[PDB]
Design a protein around this ligand. Structure first.
Ligand code: ADP
Ligand code: A5E
Ligand code: MG
Ligand code: MG
Length: 265
């Protein structure tokens, strides 16, 4: 069906390990979208063909306002092209660099939209497993949208591909190669809630080795400015034992969330 010839290409929207994401307009419809480019050689060298199919299969079939749409794909002997919904206000990552910390209203609102989208995913026992600021994008009304489903799967699962980059958002069971389920996304939710309010993730250290120690032993402290209700919700999500982590309904109806968030469940 579609091919490169159908699109005018504009400025780069961002870069990832494999992905190079461009602004684009489809010639006859004038439809604006984002084109994610993957190099076949690189995919093959790394052997993540299976992750790509997972990304395409899972994301194309999900429909939720807080989840980024995937419309289609094509390829061309050197590259694979994913056709994505364009998010015009950029990443949560960028917004955090700009402002340093989010206030309590902004944080709770983001956590609600996340919990809504994740609840929807978990209801088809899809777990995302790569929830972090550079994979959270913003729509034209500033609403959060989960993107990058390259690491997603069905639960329960094992991990067998290598974790290349940062540990900062992964629970103990996942970094230890043990087996995991849905509850991994709830841990990452606690990691995000802290980073939103403080400006850095709770287990951040100077080395891989030290970061790994701090996650497995759940070693973090709060700054004085973090209120009691935020401490309460964050302490609940960062349980070593997955089973002791809350359900998502318990996150959405937590008092701190209800007092501060400006969108509903
Ligand atoms: N639909 C989109 N709209 C705007 N920017 C995007 C979009 N998709 C990706 N980006 C930008 O490109 C970066 C890489 O996209 P992503 O799909 O996460 O690639 P990777 O799989 O390599 O992490 C993102 O962090 C974001 O900055
Ligand atoms: O609902 C849709 C499905 C596909 C789509 C596309 C734009 C350009 C190529 S394909 N835009 N909107
Ligand atoms: Mg990404
Ligand atoms: Mg990816």
């Amino acid at each position: 069906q579609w091919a490169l010839e159908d699109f005018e290409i504009g400025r780069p929207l961002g870069k990832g390990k494999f992905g190079n994401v461009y602004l684009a307009r489809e010639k006859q419809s004038k439809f604006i979208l984002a084109l994610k480019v993957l190099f076949k050689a690189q995919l093959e060298k790394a052997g993540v063909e299976h992750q790509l199919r997972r990304e395409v299969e899972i994301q194309s079939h999900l429909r939720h306002p807080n989840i980024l749409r995937l419309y289609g794909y094509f390829h061309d002997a050197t590259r694979v092209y994913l056709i994505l919904e364009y998010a015009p206000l950029g990443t949560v990552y960028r917004e955090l660099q700009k402002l340093s910390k989010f206030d309590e209203q902004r944080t709770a609102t983001y956590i609600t939209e996340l919990a809504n989208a994740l609840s929807y995913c978990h209801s088809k026992r899809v777990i995302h497993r790569d929830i972090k600021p550079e994979n959270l994008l913003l729509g034209s009304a500033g609403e959060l949208k989960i993107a990058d489903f390259g690491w997603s799967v069905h639960a329960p699962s094992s991990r067998r591909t290598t974790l290349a980059g940062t540990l900062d958002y992964l629970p103990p069971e996942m970094i230890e190669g043990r087996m995991h389920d849905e509850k991994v996304d709830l841990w990452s939710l606690g990691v995000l809630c802290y980073e939103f309010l403080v400006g850095k993730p709770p287990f951040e250290a100077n080395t891989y080795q030290e970061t790994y120690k701090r996650i497995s032993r759940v070693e973090f402290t709060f700054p004085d400015f973090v209120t009691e209700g935020a401490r309460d919700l964050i302490s609940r999500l960062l349980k070593h034992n997955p089973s002791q982590r809350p359900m998502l309904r318990e996150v959405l109806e937590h008092p701190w969330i209800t007092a501060n968030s400006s969108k509903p469940s």
